[PDB]
Amino acid sequence: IKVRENEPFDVALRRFKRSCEKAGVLAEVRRREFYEKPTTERKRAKASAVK
């Protein structure tokens, strides 16, 4: 995620990092993998997404 904004106005623009990469992708890989836990615990979200 590259950010180079012309005209100095010190505005972080942390939207990119917090739009996909950064946390969420790291916290997801922090501990062990998943194996069987993903095919469920993750798909157990659709049981919620439905309603």
Partner: protein, 117 residues
């Protein structure tokens, strides 16, 4: 001592500690600082404030190089992820580019189990 006027600032935003290493656009480190060394330890060195006193401390070590502008290389979560940058710029440093270099493998090595309580 060499006058660079513009290099780059790396930030190791680790869940436990945060260290900032100022170096020219080449990679050659000019100076560094770390929350752990900036005084407080453990329960207190892993806070957002930690990186602040650290980053600002990294400047009082390399600013003696006649630096003017400098890009930012942020990698890793935890605090001091954003805190470090602010203090850096707030120090007069003419910021320019802020890019996240946090490592993100497209599914490679197997992460450690760890933490189980």
């Amino acid at each position: 001592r060499k006058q660079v006027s513009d290099g780059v600032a790396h930030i190791h935003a680790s869940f436990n500690n945060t260290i900032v290493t100022i170096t020219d656009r080449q990679g050659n480190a000019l100076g560094w600082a770390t929350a752990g060394g900036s005084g407080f330890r453990g329960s207190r060195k892993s806070t957002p404030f930690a990186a602040q006193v650290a980053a600002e401390r990294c400047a009082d070590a390399v600013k003696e190089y006649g630096i003017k502008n400098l890009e930012v290389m942020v990698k890793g979560p935890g605090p001091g992820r954003e805190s470090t940058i602010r203090a850096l710029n707030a120090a007069g440093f003419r910021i320019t580019n802020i890019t996240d270099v946090t490592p993100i493998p497209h599914n490679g090595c197997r992460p450690p189990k760890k933490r189980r309580v």
